[PDB]
Structure formats: C-alpha cells, structure tokens
Design a protein around this ligand. Structure first.
Ligand SMILES: CC1=C(O)/C(=C\N=C/Cc2ccc(O)cc2)C(COP(=O)(O)O)=CN1
Ligand SMILES: CC1=C(O)/C(=C\N=C/Cc2ccc(O)cc2)C(COP(=O)(O)O)=CN1
Lengths: 382, 382
C-alpha cells in the first residue's frame, strides 16, 4: 503493498529491488533458451544513461537525439539496400508491424474514398506463420486477413498468393524474413514480383531476420533457399528490430518504408506511441557504428556455429529437429512437448513451445549451455 | 551516414554521441517550459541499469520484475482508492488510453454478437479537450466519437453528456483529470453518476493529473472545482503516467482497470506492445516507495508554488492567463502566439502552443527561470 505516508531510504529500496531481481533469470546464466532478446552490448548502458532524459515525442526539444534517430534509420536502410528509406526507431517489432498495417489501411482508405475498392475492410494476405502482433493489428484495425498456407518447408505458398491476387481485390501482402517459430524465410523475391505486377503493397517482417540474414556466411546458406528480402526487391516496408539481434536495449524496434512518400499515409507524429525513448535511436546508431559489418558478422556466425552444433548434437542423440536450421533457431519435435518443457523448467532450462520445443541460439547461448541442455534432455527422456 | 565494414572504437562513438547530445536541450537548463516530462529521480538511473536486461513481454523468465510491475500497479491503485485494481505499467499514456479504448470496443463487440447494440461501431463521448492519443485510437479502431463541448471553465459540459446518453446508445464516456492544454479537471463525479446509472463504461484520463491531484494542498484547491476522479467514484479505468509527474524514466505509463474482470476484454498478453521494458515497473514502485506521499506532496506543491508565482508575475505584467491555474499548467492569451513562440525560441525559451502560449511548471522550472521568462517576454512585446 500500500502507498505509505513516509518515504524510505535509497539503501532500503535498492536492496528490495535487488531481491526481486535475484528472482529473475539472467541471459548470461545458461537458463534462457527460448528468447529472441539477449544481453545488450555493454556500451549501450552508458548510452542509455546519456539519453535517458530525452523524448522523441517532442523532437523539437532534442534536436541531436532526433538526428541520431534519423542516422540510425539511415544505417538500417543502407543495410537493407535503400539510401532513401523513411522510418523510425520505435518501441519494437509490434509497433513497427502495426505502423505498416496502418499504412496499408490508409492506402485502402484513399481508394475507398474514390470508389476504387469493393472491400469494406483492407484485405491482407498473411501467412499462418505470422507473429502475434499481426493478430493485434487485425483485431484493433478491423482488417480482413486471407491466411496463406505454408509449404512443406514452412514457407509461404507463393502459388496460393498469386492465385488469390488473381481472384480477389487485395490491399496488402505480408512476407516474413525469419519466422518466429522456425526462423524460415518466405520467398520475398517472388512475393515482391506478384506485388509489383499487381500494384499491391508488400510488407516484410524482418524483426528478427533483418539483423541476421545480411551477415550469414555462405557455409550457413542452403541451396534452394532464397535469402533476398530487402529494398533491392522493391518492397514497401520492412520491420527490423535492434533489440532482437542488434544487441540494443528494449525499446529498440525499427520500421522502414521505401521512401518519404509513405509518410502521408501515416498521418491521422507518425508513430503510434507519443512520448517515447530517445536512447533506442542512439543505441541503434552506436552499436552498428561500433561493430561495423565485420563485428556483427562475427556475432551472427558465432550464433550460427552454435546453432549447427546444437542441431548436430540433437541428431546424434536421436532427437528430430523440425528443420535443418535457416537462422539461429532450432525446434525439436516432441509429442510430449508441453510436459517436457515443464520438466526442463524444473531443471533450470527454459525453452519456448508446432508440437516442438523451440530454442533461439542468441549470443548468450554457448557450447557448454548446449551440452548442458542435451544432458538434461537425455536424462528427462528416461 | 552509410553502414561501414570496419567498426569504430568506444571513444569515437561516445564522443560523436555526446556531440549530438550537446545539441539537445536539457530539463535542468531553464529552456524547456512546455513539456510534461522532466528530470527523472536520480535513483532511477541505477534501477534502469539493474533492470535493463529484462522483458515483461516474457514475464515467465523475469518473475521478480513481473512482481515489481504488479506491486507498482498496486501502489498506483492504492493511490487511486482501489486495492483490487488490475493493470499494467505500459509505454505511456497513449498505450494506456488505447488499451482502455480496446476494452470499451470489446465490451461493445460482445453486445453486437448478442444483438444488444444498434451501433455499427462503438459510440464514445469524448470531450474536445481530449489528448491526441484518442484520435489515434479512433483512427485505428474505427470508433465513432460524439465530441462533447466544454463550458466556459473549459471542462466537459455534463448536461450535454446526460442528454446524449438519453438520446443515443452510448458505449463509453471519457473524462479528463488534468487536460493537456490547460490542466482543468472534468466533473468526473457527475460523469461517473451518469455512467453508472446508464450502464456505460467510463474512462478517466489522468495521465498527468493522476500524480498531481491527490497531492494538492488545500491552498491550491479552488471552490467549486471538484477534485474527485479516482476509483472511489466507481469508474472503470484510469490512465496515470509515472513518466509525467512521477519522475520516472520513459517508458513509464500506467493503465488501471477497476478489477480483474476487465482482463477478458483485453484478450485478442493484455498490452499492445509485445517485448517491453521491465524497468518502468521497477522505477514506478521504487520512486513511490522512496518518496512516500510526503515526498510527492512536497514536489507537487513546490510546482504549484511556482505555478502561482508565474501566474502572479504574468498579471502584474499585464498578461492575460487563460484561467487561474488548476494544476501546474498556465497558458498566456496572445493573438500573435505563433510568432511570439518563435521569438521566444530564438531567445532560448521553448513553450508549446487555444490562441495561447502554454507553460507546464514541472519540477525543473524554478523561480529564476520564471523571472527570466517574464523578462524575455516583456522585451519581446516591445
Ligand atoms: C517475426 C517477428 C517476431 O518474432 C516478433 C517477436 N518475436 C519474439 C519476441 C520475444 C522476445 C523475447 C522473448 O523472451 C519472447 C518473445 C515480432 C514482435 O517484436 P517485438 O514487439 O519486439 O516483440 C515481430 N515479428
Ligand atoms: C491528458 C493526456 C496527456 O496530456 C498526454 C500527454 N501529454 C503530453 C505529452 C508530452 C510530454 C512532453 C513533451 O515535451 C511534449 C508532450 C497523454 C499521452 O501520454 P504519453 O503517451 O505518455 O505522451 C494522454 N493524456
């Protein structure tokens, strides 16, 4: 508990907080196997402190922090082969996807006002592998989704999309570059061709994959898998999150549009949030500058090294991975996955739960953690 | 800016960032007069550091940080006279208002599914003084707003609301406890009576006022103004933001519902955001514990002292305040307000822009800043 009249000392409240923090898991401890967040680059702690008292909801008061957001967006745009990208460092991939959906809906609204659409709601083709943020957008914005099926490799069925675009009036297409559950990559090149030929907005959700795919060594690329996903394909927008594989503190999400022409369709401030952090843009810019491509490549392929190590140890121990990994994500088929996940928790191993256990090999997962995991899983299986 | 192959040193990137930060204004410098954010309580810098690598989007991994969010919500609920409040420490007042609107809409949706509503969209009574986040919600969620007029004192016209509820089928009422432009307080007691008698959900936007009104000394209360706004009136939800007058770092917004029965109407995670900070809840709990009611009362009435000082100096210098201040907000009538605001900027004074200059007397505004402001404004007026 209740609000009290008298205050307490700093030592008292800090000691209480540290007691609660001790109940948390920590990324570096070998417990967390199912998270797409990880330890932040240590330099970001100083940056957060420097920029803590900024607010990109009032950029007129923080001109330098606003310039750093623009520079962060420019570095992401350059990474994605688009020097003219218009975008924002937002709160996460959810706000980024919601902003893309707002844009899609407002393009549709303009058509409706001219009589150029028989759809009473925007009609959007969305693969069934789409992240839950897309359901939040549908539920809030009254969108109609045409759920696209996936093929045997768990990527979107491009022929279905092409057929649906022929039959139906379609207002948007979603493709995923690094799905949440398995890390697979939709055929963005074909989707973008369908979209361009039919004048349909295409959004690429690269929340996770956007900071992984551009850095993959050829050893980890698979024949037949297409890795192109960015603005070189002419897509309309891309979600890409520094607080996932960019080692930046939450909140650091990213939404990039092809050019500034898209800004007018975000009119109602283009972000959903009002008051909002300035340190996300500063950290995004600084981490990408500090690492350069070489530093991020090292981290990404270190994760891929450990991902393929985990995949190999799984098969050696007669476990069945859902797929050979595409990104730093592996899933283990298990009919008793719910109970096995709970047994793993009791032994200090936290995976996520497709009837499978899901492991995200973030930079905090080392070979010793994978060895420990296999030992505990073997033991659980009798 | 362009992405580079080679990284740069920490000294290089920190020096670049500090150069951009030097272009920002800082709260403590006597420049910022129109912001509802201010300096954070210094202890929160340590808390941010401790909880930087947490994520309340995956609370199963951070049980202690999640408990601290629940305790933060409980302290706010206790402040608002509701020990059973269900709520979240979200990204800000915008997400908080959007979540209340989602709840209103889902209550309406349940009625529509039963044939209990002739409204094709939720119909919500909203005063014309409402914050822009309400327009974001209307635009995203396809809500129908009945804009309520305001009286001569700039508070919502309760008779209009009562008449509209008699004539129309209404799905929600919004009342504001501390408006953005003038800091006035709607007659929540009467609105809540109308709402309860007609079975209408009522949301109170106390984003700013929620951490001011409960701490006002009687000297600053005005005869005829009602200051009751919280769950003692039986309202359904209240937005209240620690990163406004709670001295907590962004992002620290708050949304409290009357009880846990409201959670089911937030189903599609109840927050809009997915991955999200854990330090907002930790800071909210710790700042309120560290200060206690006595510490927040001191700060609030210090701001009110300087607010009434500013109001007195304005009248002494023949300026016309829009209203005698209710909260720590004063607005100066000026036909040339746009040009005067620009002239003030050129002289280092940043107000916001009702045909008036708006000053928010946050804790960083001291008597010397108000004296400086009057001198510059006098000088500008020839
Ligand atoms: C493809 C895609 C995603 O996998 C995704 C998040 N995914 C996973 C978010 C997560 C992170 C850590 C953790 O412990 C649990 C979950 C989002 C939303 O991104 P967010 O708002 O930053 O969470 C969009 N697209
Ligand atoms: C009554 C009400 C508000 O005045 C409000 C914000 N108000 C002002 C936000 C602001 C803060 C600092 C600044 O420099 C400029 C603007 C919000 C939204 O709160 P937010 O998402 O935390 O910005 C809701 N209701």
């Amino acid at each position: 508990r209740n609000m009290q009249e008298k205050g307490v000392s700093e030592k008292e409240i800090l000691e209480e907080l540290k007691k609660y923090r001790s109940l948390d898991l920590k990324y570096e401890d070998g417990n967390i196997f199912g998270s797409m967040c990880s330890n932040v680059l240590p330099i970001t702690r100083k940056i957060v402190d420097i920029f803590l008292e900024t607010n990109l909801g009032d950029p007129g008061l923080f001109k330098g922090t606003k310039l750093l957001e623009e520079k962060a967006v420019a570095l992401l745009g350059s990474l994605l082969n688009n020097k003219d990208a218009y975008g924002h460092i937002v709160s996460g991939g959810t706000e980024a996807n919601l902003m893309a959906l707002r844009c899609i809906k407002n393009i549709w609204r303009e058509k409706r006002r001219k009589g150029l659409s028989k759809n009473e709601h925007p009609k959007i083709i969305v693969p069934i592998t789409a992240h839950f943020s897309f359901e939040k957008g549908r539920e809030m914005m009254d969108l109609e989704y045409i759920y696209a099926p996936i093929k045997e490799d768990y990527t979107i069925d491009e022929k279905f999309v092409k057929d649906a675009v022929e039959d139906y009036d379609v207002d948007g297409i979603i493709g995923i570059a690094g799905t949440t559950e398995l890390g697979t990559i939709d055929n963005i090149e074909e989707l973008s061709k369908i979209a361009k030929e039919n004048n349909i907005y295409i959004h690429v959700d690269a929340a996770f994959g956007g900071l992984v795919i551009p850095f993959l060594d050829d050893k980890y690329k698979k024949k037949g898998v297409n890795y192109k996903f960015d603005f070189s394909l002419g897509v309309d927008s891309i979600t890409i999150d520094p607080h996932a594989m960019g080692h930046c503190p939450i909140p650091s999400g990213g939404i990039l549009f092809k050019d500034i022409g898209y800004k007018r369709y975000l009119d109602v401030q283009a972000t959903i949030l009002g008051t909002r952090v300035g340190f996300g843009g500063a950290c995004t810019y600084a981490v990408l500058r500090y690492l350069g491509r070489e530093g991020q490549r090292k981290i990404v392929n270190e994760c891929m090294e450990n991902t393929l190590y985990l995949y190999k140890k799984l098969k050696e121990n007669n476990f069945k991975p859902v797929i050979e990994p595409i990104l730093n994500i592996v899933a283990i088929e298990d009919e008793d996955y719910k109970e096995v996940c709970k047994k793993l928790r009791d032994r200090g191993i936290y995976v996520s739960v497709v009837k499978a256990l899901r492991i995200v090999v973030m930079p905090h997962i080392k070979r010793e953690h994978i060895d420990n995991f296999i030992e505990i899983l073997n033991s659980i299986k009798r």
